[PDB]
Symmetry: D2
Subunit: 293 residues, 4 copies
Amino acid sequence: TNLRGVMAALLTPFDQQQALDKASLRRLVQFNIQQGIDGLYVGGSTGEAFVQSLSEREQVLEIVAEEAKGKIKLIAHVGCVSTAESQQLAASAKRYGFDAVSAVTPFYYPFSFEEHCDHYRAIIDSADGLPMVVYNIPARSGVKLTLDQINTLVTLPGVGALKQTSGDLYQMEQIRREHPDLVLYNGYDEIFASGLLAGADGGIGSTYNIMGWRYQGIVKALKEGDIQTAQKLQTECNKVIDLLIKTGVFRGLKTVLHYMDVVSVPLCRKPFGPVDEKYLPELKALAQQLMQE
Amino acid sequence: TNLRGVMAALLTPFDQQQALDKASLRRLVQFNIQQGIDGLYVGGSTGEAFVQSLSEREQVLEIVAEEAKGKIKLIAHVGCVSTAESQQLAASAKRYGFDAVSAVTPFYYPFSFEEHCDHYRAIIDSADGLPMVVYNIPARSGVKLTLDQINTLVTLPGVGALKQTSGDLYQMEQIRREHPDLVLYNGYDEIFASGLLAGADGGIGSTYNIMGWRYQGIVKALKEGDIQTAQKLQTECNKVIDLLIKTGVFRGLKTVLHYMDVVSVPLCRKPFGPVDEKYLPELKALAQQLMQERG
Amino acid sequence: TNLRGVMAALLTPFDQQQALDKASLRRLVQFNIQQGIDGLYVGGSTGEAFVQSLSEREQVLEIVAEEAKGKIKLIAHVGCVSTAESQQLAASAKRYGFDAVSAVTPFYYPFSFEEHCDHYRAIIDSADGLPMVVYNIPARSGVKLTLDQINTLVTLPGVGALKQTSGDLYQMEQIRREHPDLVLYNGYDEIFASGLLAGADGGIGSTYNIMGWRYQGIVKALKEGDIQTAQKLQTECNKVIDLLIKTGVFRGLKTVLHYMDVVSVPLCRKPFGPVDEKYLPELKALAQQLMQERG
Amino acid sequence: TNLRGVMAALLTPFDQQQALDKASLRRLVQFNIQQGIDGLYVGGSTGEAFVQSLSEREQVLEIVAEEAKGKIKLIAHVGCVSTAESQQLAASAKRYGFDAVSAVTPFYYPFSFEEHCDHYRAIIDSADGLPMVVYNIPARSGVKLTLDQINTLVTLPGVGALKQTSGDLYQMEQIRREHPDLVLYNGYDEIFASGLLAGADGGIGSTYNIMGWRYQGIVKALKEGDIQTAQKLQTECNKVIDLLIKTGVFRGLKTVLHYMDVVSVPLCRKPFGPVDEKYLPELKALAQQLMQERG
């Protein structure tokens, strides 16, 4: 029932025709489980949910539950701009046995804060008992929540956690101060160590798919007062992030996983383009060093 | 086909269960045709495309085509974040008989300019001959194109127009200067007259659904050098936009159309909430006012 | 006491050592008068006020008054971040015989709206009779005033105008609608024609120093309903602005004025760098073109 | 000279008439020295530099050097928008015996990166031996430097440190990784512990004026691997910052200093207004808590 921890934001493998690569998805789930990951955040931004249809997202949720249910925590990101579509995914997540649901603040169209609250309330209702993880990512959603609005969201009945994908660590601390028991996930992998120090008690990130144990290592180092190890691991994580940002994050991660024999075809769906070939050697070298870890 | 003109960005009527209200959609299409609108821009932001499934968007495109094909120009907004989804809609638009397609710059995920270009190229291919209207809306999409990038997109083979939903009239003038023959649509209704003066030769807007004749009137007034009338009309349009922004634009427009006996249920899809009851009297009064401007 | 019109935002010529070039400042004032400009806005952003000391700004105000008092309208930009500094400039503007004062919304530090109001009130007190022109330039000040805050500012006792350096023409129209008698200056030269159509009744601009007659031409053309001429003139002004933005605006303007035999040394003060020599051909040609335009 | 450490961004006390309160400036310098602060950053944003004249800024630099030279490290913020003005202050900092100079990226006018670089080179020359602390504060300056540009700046001859007033701790870490020996100051007090963890090796902040020993405590706790104590201290600091942001930061700090009998009059210069009276009891209580914390 404890949602605290390090949860990888699962990527969605696609085959040559851009259809779901089921075999690769199953391999990826098993791969994450073997890294000692606490759970999987499925169908989020990282899973390329916004370039998938509802039935495609459901298929991914169903398959992941099959592979991981009862082995690790499973959080289903069911967010869509539409409340109705989000509720359908929420209902499916409950049906498949997920531990919790999550929804990004609905975007593109401007919605009032009250409309955002009602959107979450409606999804929580359809989640039929699964706790909700509010997902705040201003840089992508364009939705800028105030601390006060955040306080209201995380106290909504049915909400059990906040995925804070914001680099504002003053706000991270304020949220922790206001909610001592809240499950608070750091969302920007590149500041994970600093985010934990500011108050997060876990994290959800796309890079956990290829080096989740490093983040688990940061949590442990900070708990043990081993600052140096925490800083060294974060630095190694950031060297990797530097590269992934240059290559394109999702495509870069899938390419590394391809060289790790997990993903058959490392492509993202259009309009994402392929990785620039000039980066393949660094991505292959990265996969090699990670495998030897 | 000449795509220049004042085209309403068609709203999509829904009922209490949030299902498409087909009868109201048909009534709204006819209402727009009766206003003397030059055409309709279907399934765009205004049509609440982003809270609809591909099948729902296709049903709307087909019904509008059935109702208006050959009577007015029809532009199908087929844009999705996904290129494949956008291509499917593009193929359907071609099948249904649309005159053109349009696609908002893909959003949420950051894409390089080259990826945007390939996205439009791919859609143009699926549009199988239907010209493409590039849709620029920085305020909503978050995609900030430079004049140079816009120049490249507008010159892509198969692109016949640009829907410029930007309040930057310096850029509007620059685009016109660089592309004298480009069909250039003013996207922000609230600066329509100034947009035409800067270089736009038409426009696409949501408020055209309820007062398209005022915008056609601005076009004509400027064509005759009657600046006073053009300003008078823009001011009235803005008095209305002031209200719609307070009430919520789409829901406010649907509510006005409901009072005009066009739309049965003025609801937008969740998460959009209903119009605050305190605004109904002003919206009803607006409906009455507008109905009188038509004689 | 009529402040409506086309006013050039005066540049401040400097000598090789970056000290004020008085002879060139006097020649530039005379050049602007000779163009038929309605007035001068002195010591504003364009005058490089923010890279000048209080005493240097006062010296410029004093010299411009000597040259032009009574011949054209004179607006003294006395805005500083500090209220006391602004008040000293305001008091000097009064002493020198200026017609009005102006102040950019205090920047760098974030101030509350009530603090901005008290700032203007204090300057107004020190202007002792000279009306205040509120200066709104969000792109530079970082101060994003709301429509309602703007309404409170332009209704402060002693405020006689608003310099609206914003490209939001919906807001321009809203301001005109709320204040029909307000002197409202369009601040972005590149959208001058569109800003007048939206409701501005004049403008203050840096490019007026080299082609003021074109903007006066736009005003006249719109007043006569000749839209083609207004657009053609705005297009010509924008071709120039395209160039100036590439070259750096103040330095490009000073360079054109150097080739018109007005400004001895066309440099701006550090950290502004000199104009890239690759642009000198176009700037030289522009100066020739402009001189030919007046016969 | 070792510039690493916790340096208070010194406030500038003003008297009842808003002139510099020299006596209080001296006592505040001594108060800071007494809490074990590593140094003082003088005449910065926090010092209300931008509402002071050059002579007033020099006067403050001179007085602070008189009180503290040789006792703690002294960094003179000499930054102005003008390069020449910055150079004059830099020469003064040198004459007064400061250990380093610093300059905020010139603001208001947009300058190219090359111009920013030349601005720093010129000040470095005038500083005559005093190392330069590049001051990056995007939220105030409006200047958005890329990591690559930051690298160029910190490697300019004469640059000895970077005052990173940015909440982006990914960039903080990238800077440390690219420059292992660089003196890197965390500029946002509210993320100090996290900033140190990301790679900063010290900090410059306004709240150090009233509770600098707490920040020194965070430095010490992290060095000893005592995470809990570091977090507890940061939390206490943030409770204070929460209040200061509500009260207005500089005025709030000055008021606490007034209650601690350090500053005679807690006024900021206009346009900053006074502290809202409803907050005085909380500020006085804070002053009492902080005084009780010193034994």
